Short mmCIF file of all heavy atoms in Angstrom, two decimals:
data_model
loop_
_atom_site.label_atom_id
_atom_site.label_comp_id
_atom_site.label_asym_id
_atom_site.label_seq_id
_atom_site.Cartn_x
_atom_site.Cartn_y
_atom_site.Cartn_z
N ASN L 1 -10.80 -14.18 9.45
CA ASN L 1 -11.62 -12.99 9.71
C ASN L 1 -10.87 -12.05 10.69
O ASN L 1 -11.07 -10.81 10.60
CB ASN L 1 -13.00 -13.42 10.31
CG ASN L 1 -13.86 -14.15 9.29
OD1 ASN L 1 -13.43 -14.33 8.13
ND2 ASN L 1 -14.99 -14.67 9.68
N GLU L 2 -10.17 -12.66 11.62
CA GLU L 2 -9.45 -11.73 12.56
C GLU L 2 -8.22 -11.13 11.98
O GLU L 2 -7.79 -10.01 12.24
CB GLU L 2 -9.04 -12.55 13.81
CG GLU L 2 -10.11 -12.76 14.86
CD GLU L 2 -9.56 -13.19 16.14
OE1 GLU L 2 -8.93 -14.30 16.20
OE2 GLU L 2 -9.77 -12.62 17.15
N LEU L 3 -7.61 -11.81 10.97
CA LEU L 3 -6.45 -11.28 10.19
C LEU L 3 -6.84 -10.39 9.03
O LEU L 3 -5.90 -9.72 8.49
CB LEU L 3 -5.49 -12.41 9.79
CG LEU L 3 -4.74 -13.20 10.87
CD1 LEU L 3 -4.28 -14.51 10.31
CD2 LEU L 3 -3.65 -12.37 11.39
N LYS L 4 -8.11 -10.41 8.63
CA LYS L 4 -8.49 -9.54 7.49
C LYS L 4 -8.18 -8.11 7.64
O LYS L 4 -7.76 -7.50 6.73
CB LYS L 4 -9.98 -9.84 7.15
CG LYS L 4 -10.51 -9.00 6.00
CD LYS L 4 -11.75 -9.61 5.42
CE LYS L 4 -12.17 -8.84 4.19
NZ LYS L 4 -13.40 -9.48 3.57
N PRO L 5 -8.42 -7.41 8.83
CA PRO L 5 -7.93 -6.07 8.95
C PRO L 5 -6.48 -5.87 8.82
O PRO L 5 -5.96 -4.97 8.22
CB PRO L 5 -8.35 -5.69 10.44
CG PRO L 5 -9.40 -6.69 10.82
CD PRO L 5 -9.16 -7.93 9.98
N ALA L 6 -5.68 -6.90 9.27
CA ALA L 6 -4.17 -6.84 9.15
C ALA L 6 -3.80 -6.95 7.63
O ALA L 6 -2.91 -6.21 7.22
CB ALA L 6 -3.52 -7.95 9.90
N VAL L 7 -4.43 -7.82 6.92
CA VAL L 7 -4.15 -8.06 5.44
C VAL L 7 -4.61 -6.78 4.74
O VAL L 7 -3.83 -6.33 3.80
CB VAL L 7 -4.90 -9.26 4.91
CG1 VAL L 7 -4.71 -9.39 3.44
CG2 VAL L 7 -4.25 -10.55 5.59
N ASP L 8 -5.73 -6.23 5.06
CA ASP L 8 -6.14 -4.91 4.31
C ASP L 8 -5.27 -3.85 4.64
O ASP L 8 -4.85 -3.05 3.70
CB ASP L 8 -7.52 -4.56 4.84
CG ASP L 8 -8.65 -5.60 4.33
OD1 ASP L 8 -8.28 -6.45 3.51
OD2 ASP L 8 -9.82 -5.53 4.85
N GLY L 9 -4.71 -3.67 5.87
CA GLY L 9 -3.73 -2.68 6.16
C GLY L 9 -2.39 -2.95 5.46
O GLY L 9 -1.78 -1.97 4.97
N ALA L 10 -1.97 -4.16 5.40
CA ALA L 10 -0.78 -4.50 4.65
C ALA L 10 -0.89 -4.11 3.21
O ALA L 10 0.04 -3.52 2.60
CB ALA L 10 -0.44 -5.93 4.79
N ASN L 11 -2.04 -4.43 2.57
CA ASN L 11 -2.25 -4.01 1.22
C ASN L 11 -2.31 -2.52 0.98
O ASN L 11 -1.82 -2.00 0.00
CB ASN L 11 -3.51 -4.69 0.62
CG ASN L 11 -3.26 -6.12 0.15
OD1 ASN L 11 -3.85 -7.13 0.64
ND2 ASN L 11 -2.44 -6.28 -0.82
N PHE L 12 -2.86 -1.82 2.01
CA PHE L 12 -2.99 -0.39 1.94
C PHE L 12 -1.63 0.25 1.95
O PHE L 12 -1.28 1.16 1.16
CB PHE L 12 -3.90 0.18 2.98
CG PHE L 12 -4.07 1.70 2.97
CD1 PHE L 12 -5.00 2.22 2.05
CD2 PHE L 12 -3.30 2.49 3.79
CE1 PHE L 12 -5.10 3.58 2.02
CE2 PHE L 12 -3.46 3.86 3.69
CZ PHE L 12 -4.34 4.44 2.84
N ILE L 13 -0.76 -0.16 2.90
CA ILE L 13 0.57 0.30 3.00
C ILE L 13 1.31 -0.02 1.73
O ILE L 13 2.09 0.83 1.20
CB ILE L 13 1.36 -0.26 4.25
CG1 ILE L 13 0.45 -0.04 5.54
CG2 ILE L 13 2.71 0.41 4.35
CD1 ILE L 13 0.78 -1.14 6.59
N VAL L 14 1.15 -1.20 1.13
CA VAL L 14 1.90 -1.59 -0.04
C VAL L 14 1.51 -0.73 -1.22
O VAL L 14 2.37 -0.19 -1.84
CB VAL L 14 1.58 -3.12 -0.32
CG1 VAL L 14 1.97 -3.48 -1.81
CG2 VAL L 14 2.39 -4.00 0.57
N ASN L 15 0.20 -0.41 -1.36
CA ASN L 15 -0.26 0.42 -2.43
C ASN L 15 0.25 1.90 -2.24
O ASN L 15 0.61 2.56 -3.15
CB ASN L 15 -1.79 0.34 -2.52
CG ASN L 15 -2.31 -0.95 -3.06
OD1 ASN L 15 -1.63 -1.67 -3.84
ND2 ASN L 15 -3.50 -1.36 -2.50
N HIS L 16 0.23 2.33 -0.99
CA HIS L 16 0.82 3.66 -0.64
C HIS L 16 2.25 3.79 -1.13
O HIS L 16 2.60 4.69 -1.80
CB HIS L 16 0.59 3.97 0.69
CG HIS L 16 1.06 5.35 1.14
ND1 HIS L 16 0.18 6.40 1.20
CD2 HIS L 16 2.24 5.78 1.52
CE1 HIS L 16 0.89 7.49 1.64
NE2 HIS L 16 2.13 7.20 1.83
N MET L 17 3.11 2.86 -0.72
CA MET L 17 4.56 2.99 -1.01
C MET L 17 4.73 2.82 -2.52
O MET L 17 5.57 3.46 -3.17
CB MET L 17 5.35 1.93 -0.27
CG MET L 17 5.15 1.89 1.25
SD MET L 17 5.55 3.45 2.27
CE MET L 17 6.66 4.37 1.18
N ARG L 18 3.94 1.91 -3.15
CA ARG L 18 4.09 1.75 -4.68
C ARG L 18 3.73 3.06 -5.36
O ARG L 18 4.39 3.51 -6.32
CB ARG L 18 3.20 0.58 -5.20
CG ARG L 18 3.83 -0.03 -6.34
CD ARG L 18 2.93 -1.30 -6.82
NE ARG L 18 2.81 -2.27 -5.79
CZ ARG L 18 3.56 -3.38 -5.81
NH1 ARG L 18 4.63 -3.62 -6.57
NH2 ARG L 18 3.30 -4.21 -4.86
N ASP L 19 2.61 3.67 -5.01
CA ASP L 19 2.25 4.86 -5.66
C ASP L 19 3.23 6.01 -5.38
O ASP L 19 3.53 6.81 -6.27
CB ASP L 19 0.83 5.41 -5.11
CG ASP L 19 -0.27 4.40 -5.49
OD1 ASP L 19 -0.08 3.66 -6.52
OD2 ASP L 19 -1.31 4.34 -4.83
N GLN L 20 3.74 6.08 -4.14
CA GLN L 20 4.75 7.11 -3.84
C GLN L 20 6.02 6.84 -4.64
O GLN L 20 6.66 7.84 -5.16
CB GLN L 20 5.08 7.03 -2.35
CG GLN L 20 5.76 8.31 -1.81
CD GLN L 20 4.74 9.40 -1.60
OE1 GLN L 20 4.30 10.07 -2.55
NE2 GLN L 20 4.32 9.63 -0.39
N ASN L 21 6.41 5.61 -4.90
CA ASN L 21 7.61 5.31 -5.72
C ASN L 21 7.36 5.72 -7.14
O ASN L 21 8.24 6.24 -7.77
CB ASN L 21 7.96 3.80 -5.58
CG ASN L 21 8.37 3.46 -4.19
OD1 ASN L 21 8.81 4.30 -3.38
ND2 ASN L 21 8.21 2.18 -3.76
N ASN L 22 6.22 5.42 -7.64
CA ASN L 22 5.96 5.79 -9.06
C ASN L 22 5.94 7.38 -9.23
O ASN L 22 6.44 7.80 -10.22
CB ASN L 22 4.61 5.21 -9.50
CG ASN L 22 4.63 3.63 -9.59
OD1 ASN L 22 5.70 3.09 -9.47
ND2 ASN L 22 3.49 3.07 -9.76
N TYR L 23 5.32 7.98 -8.24
CA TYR L 23 5.39 9.52 -8.24
C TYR L 23 6.81 9.92 -8.26
O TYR L 23 7.18 10.91 -8.97
CB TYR L 23 4.56 9.97 -6.99
CG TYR L 23 4.18 11.36 -6.98
CD1 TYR L 23 2.89 11.83 -7.50
CD2 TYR L 23 4.99 12.40 -6.44
CE1 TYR L 23 2.60 13.13 -7.46
CE2 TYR L 23 4.66 13.71 -6.45
CZ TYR L 23 3.38 14.09 -6.93
OH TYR L 23 3.06 15.37 -6.85
N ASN L 24 7.61 9.35 -7.35
CA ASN L 24 9.05 9.78 -7.33
C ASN L 24 9.74 9.53 -8.65
O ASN L 24 10.57 10.42 -9.03
CB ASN L 24 9.67 9.02 -6.13
CG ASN L 24 9.19 9.47 -4.80
OD1 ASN L 24 8.59 10.52 -4.61
ND2 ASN L 24 9.49 8.60 -3.81
N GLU L 25 9.52 8.38 -9.19
CA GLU L 25 10.26 8.09 -10.42
C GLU L 25 9.84 9.07 -11.50
O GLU L 25 10.69 9.52 -12.35
CB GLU L 25 9.98 6.71 -10.93
CG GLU L 25 11.15 5.73 -10.77
CD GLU L 25 11.56 5.40 -9.40
OE1 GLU L 25 10.76 5.65 -8.54
OE2 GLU L 25 12.68 4.97 -9.20
N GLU L 26 8.53 9.49 -11.60
CA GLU L 26 8.18 10.50 -12.60
C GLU L 26 8.92 11.81 -12.27
O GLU L 26 9.28 12.59 -13.16
CB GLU L 26 6.68 10.68 -12.56
CG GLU L 26 6.29 11.63 -13.70
CD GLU L 26 5.11 11.05 -14.62
OE1 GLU L 26 5.16 9.83 -14.92
OE2 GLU L 26 4.21 11.74 -14.97
#
């Protein structure tokens, strides 16, 4: 429960960089 904000933030950063990379490749 204490690490859930950290895991959510990690997933948000991961999704952000993945979306940015796909945008760049297009």
Side-chain angles (χ1 to χ4, degrees):
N1 293 357
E2 279 194 303
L3 291 163
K4 182 159 183 177
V7 172
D8 293 348
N11 276 117
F12 182 82
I13 311 149
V14 164
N15 292 327
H16 180 96
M17 308 300 338
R18 210 180 299 265
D19 295 338
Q20 201 77 282
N21 295 337
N22 294 350
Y23 197 92
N24 293 342
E25 252 67 20
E26 187 128 322

